[PDB]
Amino acid sequence: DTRPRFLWQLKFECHFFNGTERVRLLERCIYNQEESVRFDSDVGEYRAVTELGRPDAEYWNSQKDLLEQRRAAVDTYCRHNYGVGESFTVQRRVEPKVTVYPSKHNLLVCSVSGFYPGSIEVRWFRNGQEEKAGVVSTGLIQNGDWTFQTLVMLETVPRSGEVYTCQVEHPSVTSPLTVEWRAS
Amino acid sequence: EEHVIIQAEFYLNPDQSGEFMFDFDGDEIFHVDMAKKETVWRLEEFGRFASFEAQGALANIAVDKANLEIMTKRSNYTPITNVPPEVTVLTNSPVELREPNVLICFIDKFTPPVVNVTWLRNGKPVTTGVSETVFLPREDHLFRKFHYLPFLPSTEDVYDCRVEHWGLDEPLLKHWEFD
Amino acid sequence: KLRCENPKKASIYLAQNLNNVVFTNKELEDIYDLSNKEETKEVLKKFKEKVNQFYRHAFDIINKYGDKEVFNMMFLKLSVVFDIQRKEANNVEQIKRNIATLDEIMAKADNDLCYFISQ
């Protein structure tokens, strides 16, 4: 099929800072790869991102009652849904499954998989000596099923007997998870 | 501390397709299957703590449809640029032989959201146990999508996430194999 | 129809000024003609009857009450239903679901109408 396509998008976004102390609501309308109108809770009304969205902004901002309910959506919609789901979204705590294995003898990788949230802290140690030279991380990978994974690689392989230690500090555990790797 | 909750909907023409879902820091909470008028929770545990009526999302798609047809005539029927997708094939965890895992096909940075995703095992399509998400939103207004093939890792099988998008010329095949 | 004792919440979408939402008789026949197999004949009569029931109920609302918001929203939601009907016009289960859906939309229309009049 070679017919032209036309796409329309609509997003409502709630931003939480320090629990529910500061809440920012961002509603966006996207037509064909380009945002055209947006609502910002800080601004408190619709702003035309482009000239395509200009008629929408002058139209939606002219409805008083729906703007008040959209400003108040920090409480009735953002704060409410935060309390509804914080027991399984914010307070969700899934322990990382940490394992180590050497690729091919270098680039020692520490697999931090199946954890939540994504605020991970991976540090490499050489018998207590925190090695920061050869550390390379692939990044924070999102699996789409409320989990995360991350591979952190340490370039410098040691001599025999130098026990490298991958320490993982995650909000799900108070005592950091340490998985040690031995040498030749 | 920073947390984001997103409710994302879209409507597409002339395929006449729609969507409605909820997002938390880039992870989906629930979506509604308008054909069955049922609320589907991304994880089954989420239904025991909260409830959403799928009936209310019908009126949102009916507004998304009428919005798209107004924007089409306004832009002088300017077609969307068929941006080809970047496709990554991941796994849920480090893989081991004869130990269940989940192949993940991360289809990223594409528009419009029409993709013919097909899991191919040694060249033939597979639908046994195949799961998928909905078109997940993005900051750059492109789309993400996850397709899951619960599979038993082995060295005798190879897998392809054949992705067909109108921004390509031939089907996009991203390979995966063990070791 | 007496006013609902406990009307539910009613959203607003600004659908007062939409035109050309009602499918004409010719467009309906094109939808029905997609049901041509040997198993859809019994259920199509129910579908056409309920659609005929939907049209009379919808066109009765505009007569006295004249609530354009819920009238247009009814057909805008019907447009979504006919989209499902177009993609599967020989699915027996889906047609019955679309019948229930069209009854839900009529129920929602009454539910929203008794709310708006009280307000």
């Binding site: 609509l10 409502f12 509603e27 008629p55 929408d56 139209y59 939606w60 409805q63 729906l66 959209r70 959506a73 009735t76 919609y77 409410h80 849904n81 509804v84 789901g85 | 409710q7 909907e9 909820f22 909470i29 629930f30 909260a50 409830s51 959403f52 009526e53 209310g56 999302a57 009126a59 949102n60 507004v63 998304d64 009428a66 919005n67 107004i70 924007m71 | 959203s11 607003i12 979408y13 600004l14 659908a15 000024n17 939409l18």
Partner: peptide, 12 residues
């Protein structure tokens, strides 16, 4: 309890 939803508007 129940999750809530925000409703869009219709363009002119």
């Amino acid at each position: 309890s129940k999750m809530r939803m925000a409703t869009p508007l219709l363009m002119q």
